[PDB]
Each structure stands twice: as structure tokens, then as C-alpha cells.
Design an enzyme around this catalytic site. Sequence first.
Site, PDB file in Angstrom:
ATOM      1  CG  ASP A  35      -1.873   1.351   1.361  1.00 35.34           C
ATOM      2  OD1 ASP A  35      -1.920   1.951   0.500  1.00 35.34           O
ATOM      3  OD2 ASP A  35      -2.363   1.266   2.301  1.00 35.34           O
ATOM      4  CB  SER A 199      -1.998  14.163 -13.516  1.00 41.16           C
ATOM      5  OG  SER A 199      -2.482  13.952 -15.107  1.00 41.16           O
TER       6      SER A 199
END
Length: 330
Positions: A35, A199
Site C-alpha cells: 500500500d 498530472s
Amino acid sequence: STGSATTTPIDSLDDAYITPVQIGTPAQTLNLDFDTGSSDLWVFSSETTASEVDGQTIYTPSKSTTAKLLSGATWSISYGDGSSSSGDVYTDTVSVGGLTVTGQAVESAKKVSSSFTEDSTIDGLLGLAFSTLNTVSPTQQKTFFDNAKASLDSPVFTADLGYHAPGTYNFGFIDTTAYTGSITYTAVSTKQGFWEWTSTGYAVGSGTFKSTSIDGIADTGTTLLYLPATVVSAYWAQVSGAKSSSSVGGYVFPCSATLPSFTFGVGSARIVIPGDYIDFGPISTGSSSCFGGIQSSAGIGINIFGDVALKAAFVVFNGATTPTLGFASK
């Protein structure tokens, strides 16, 4: 040193991925959910409340000659899906795919919430975010990667998740045969403890690319792709009959649909998520309404590039002095 381990979807939907991890002496192998959105290595154990264990493999520290109680240490964690676990702490030897850390903090669960109990395939979590998020008190502990880092050939790990298939986590090297083209690296902020990056935009299907900055985290422990409501609406608007359902808890679409791809930007490069990756199947058994793999981050407070996004790429988690993230197509 290096390590390499195969990671395998827990079910036919790729709801999560499990990777075998050796703990203790003699080894006890548990299947852990790696994770990159948290920083605790915790396991079901001989100390876990019996009624909260349902099929998981347990760590039994009393059977490990190298286990030592970390005296007075406790931990307690709550995740974004409302799940939680807590307990005490041992140090022990932990190995992944041939890479060994001695004295790793292994957080033994005394209590786990129902969603963990109900998932028989996940024996615990191995956190790979920054150690500043580790919950052990009163002495915060380091992640497996943080402990291994100095010994690794290169201070990196990579995630190569499969779509309905196994994949690979590598530590300490970049497998140049595992991706196409080049890896595009992008800046990371560690201020919130995550692999947080920006992004450069998105496209829906064959549509025109929209240049827009989207701050979010690369999180292998989150199943879906959570993005701003504007972006998510633009995607689902291209799917006949798709709608946000308050009762179901997100966007659903007719199971008869063919989904468009979704592209996200990494610097000047582009990662394309095939439409099929965005299908999470019937909302309930036998339903013709299917759950979408792209959902709104509104009310989460952060955008999350979870498995839906990451499995479309070869992803480098670069833990150099100034950390960065790399993405390649594959």
C-alpha cells in the site's frame, strides 16, 4: 541488494493485490496488500480477537525466534474507506522476494474492522508511503522500504500491476524489459506523507487532450481512480446510460456498454487506461448495472491514482534524496 515478488489480484475484479511476505524465523508467509498510500506494516496475528479472524493466515510471534516485543509500542490506523485496525508491535525479520530487513516493525493486530475480517485473502498491509505517516506510538517506526533503502542497489521500488493477471513488485532495480518506450519522471511532494504528484491533464477515449493540473497520489492500496468531479463527469458523459447514483455510492453504467479509454498526462507523456480496466462489474450479483472504475474525489479531499490507473503503467517509486515518480507505458 534487490528483491522481486509477484503480486496477484485477490479476485476477478482486481479489487486488491496480494504479495507473499516472509516474517520471522522460521519464516511465516503472509499475503500482504502493498500500500503506497500508508506507512504501517500490520498483520493478522495470534493476538487478533478470535471472532475477527475468518480465514486469514496469522503471524504468531511466539513461534519466531527472532521476534522481540517493542515494549510499550501501540498502533492504530483508520483508512479512507472507514476501515481500521490496531494493536501492539514486534520487531522481526521480514523478507520480500529475496530482500531481507532485520528489525522491521511488524504491527500485530489485536482488533480489525469488519471489512478486514470479511476479506479472507488479505493477511495484512505493507505500507510504502513515507515513514512520517507511520502510526506507531510513542516511537514512530520506519517502513520496509525506508529500512531497506540504503542497502538497495538503487533506492527505488517499482509497481507493475496486472489487469486480471499477476504482476510484480521489484526493490532496488528497474527492469528495463518490463515497459515500452521511456520512463517519464515527475516531481513528488512529500509534505502530506504520500507519493503526491501533479498530472498534466487527461483525455476521454479518442478525444482531445485537456491540459489541466491534477494533484493526486499514487496509491497501490486504493482500487479505483478518484479524480475531480468535472473530469469524472466528462468521462461518464461518453457512456450511454451512465449516471451518478447516490444510493450505490458513485457512477454506474449499463453492463451492456463498451467503455472508452481514459488517458492521463505525466509531463509531456501519456498513459492510456483501456476501457475494460474501468469496468468493476455488476453492483450486486446478477445486476445489469455495473460499477465504474473512475469516480469523483469530491469529499475525499485528495485525488487518488489507484490501481485502475497504476495497472496501466510501469511505475517507479524513486526514493532518492529528492523523491520522484516515474511512469512508462507497457
